Amino acid sequence: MAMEMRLPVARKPLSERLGRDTKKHLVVPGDTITTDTGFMRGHGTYMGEEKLIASVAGSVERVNKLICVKALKTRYIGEVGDIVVGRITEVQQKRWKVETNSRLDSVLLLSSMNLPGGELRRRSAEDELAMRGFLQEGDLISAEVQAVFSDGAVSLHTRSLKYGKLGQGVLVQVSPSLVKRQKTHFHDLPCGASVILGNNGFIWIYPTPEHKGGFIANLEPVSLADREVISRLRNCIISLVTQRMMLYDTSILYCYEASLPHQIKDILKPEIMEEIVMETRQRLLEQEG
Amino acid sequence: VVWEEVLIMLPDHVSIILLSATVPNALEFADWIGRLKRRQIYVISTVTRPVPLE
């Protein structure tokens, strides 16, 4: 124990460490985008006088009639059939309110919820009294968006077996633009734990559920060999998410394997992160390429 | 195809009651329904339709 005290170091700009030239088209608000006979405005732009004027910093992406600008920092926008993770912040008479890093709050209707029992027994006003008992304040769920309201609000449902209240683990919050769209956002990484890559920016890390809805508590001690894996994935996720890297299964597996040689406690330094991110970059380069 | 798609997508907590009108090969259609779902079905058929008509 020495309580090391280093000194701040000036940042090196322009990313000269690798060296690349962009071939894209970049704009800033006020710039006049192509103004041909007929075009359709996207999200990020607006129209003035016979002019398509960009309204946010980013890069233009067009698919065959459509000029739009993709910003690099926004809040989550809901879409149909999108996996999200949220937390209960208000319990109302006939609904809950969930925060999922959006411009508003998200509503979980009582009509869409896997009540205890998991079968056809009954649904009446007697359940309304105890609905506010089990889904209390500050709990974690994992649901799926149902529909889009008329003011940007999102309604999310829990009509499956893989959805419901979550258990033990750790949570890491990042920006909701570093999660890669896929067809399987549920993963069972062969390390000793699992992960859910929420499209809204919520990353949940929990141990594998041994064999085989919130009915089971399982509030019993977790083995020592599982915590070290969860801490390793927590630190690796922070490392990959920070500089640029877009997140998905192979990048996390690659960095996890790359993180074995030295201890989990000592990886917080600016350079050890660099020597791991560069190694993952080149391993991805020698595998994809 | 509408009926087949519904029947496959229908969950296992519902007890369906099919009402056909004397379909010949009904002894295996309910076999297939009773095997797709972990459920047991019963088949009833009659003869001698009343109010005879020529």
Partner: protein
């Protein structure tokens, strides 16, 4: 050794390439067998029988795996040919990932292919609501088509800017592995009920509408309530893209279409 066998090629005049080629393999195989080595050794028959039995065993297990295999499905090649046509168009990108243009079509009711390309390829989004409420009738009118030469000059242009999109989707439809002709694909679209819904939407009484129109007024109301559903579902697409220029004249058309005869329905409503 055998009586002289008739020539399968020359004696019976069967001038089939397969027949001649199979004959040549048979003669070549007999010649090569005449120089065989294994026939001579001590236990050729027993090990030959063992090899035969083993070959049948391998064949039986591979047949059983093929029976319990996904490639055994009948229409799976058709499903693949119906996926490649959905990928050549920029809807699906690579191996089960859907683009943004592929998410607009999911939240529709009918004619997803012809309607998303119309939303993108700008041919309707620069017209007044009372007209685009008439062009959209050609999809679901379900009647024989005979237009009127007294219609405006823009309608005689407005009709082929969607048949061109039909003659743009048909070529990729046919040359992708599908067995549906391009012409019968364009034959689905007909424009019998195009002018009547126009004066109907402008706000003219139905009494002379039925008289002038050459069709009974029983399918008009159903075509209307079919049209109003797609106009109610295009709002979610205009909102998803973020282009309220069309989403405003479409909302005006939607409120301009709701009459009171449509909602009459039955006797004991209330």
């Amino acid at each position: 050794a055998g009586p002289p066998t008739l020539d399968p090629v020359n004696d019976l005049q069967l001038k089939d390439m397969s027949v001649v080629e199979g004959g040549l393999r048979a003669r070549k195989l007999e010649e090569l067998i005449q120089g065989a080595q294994c026939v001579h050794s001590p236990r050729f028959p027993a090990q030959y029988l063992k090899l035969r039995e083993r070959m049948q065993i391998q064949k039986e297990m591979e047949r059983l795996r093929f029976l319990l295999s996904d490639q055994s499905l009948l229409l799976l090649p058709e499903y693949h040919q119906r996926v490649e046509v959905l990928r050549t168009l920029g809807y699906v990108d690579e191996a089960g990932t859907v683009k943004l243009a592929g998410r607009v079509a999911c939240a529709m009711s009918s004619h997803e292919l012809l309607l998303t390309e119309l939303m993108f390829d700008n041919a309707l989004s620069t017209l007044r609501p009372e007209e685009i409420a008439a062009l959209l009738s050609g999809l679901v009118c379900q009647s024989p088509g005979d237009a009127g030469d007294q219609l405006p000059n823009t309608l005689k242009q407005g009709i082929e800017r969607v048949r061109a999109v039909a003659k743009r989707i048909g070529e990729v439809q046919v040359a992708c592995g599908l067995n549906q002709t391009v012409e019968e694909f364009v034959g689905e679209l007909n424009f019998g009920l195009v002018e009547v819904v126009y004066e109907w939407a402008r706000g003219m009484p139905f009494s002379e509408l039925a008289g002038l129109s050459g069709t009974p007024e029983g399918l008009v109301v159903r075509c209307i309530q079919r049209l109003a559903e797609m106009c109610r579902s295009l709002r979610g697409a205009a909102r998803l893209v973020g282009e309220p220029v069309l989403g405003a004249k479409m909302e005006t058309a939607a409120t301009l279409l709701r009459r009171d005869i449509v909602f009459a329905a039955s006797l004991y409503t209330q």
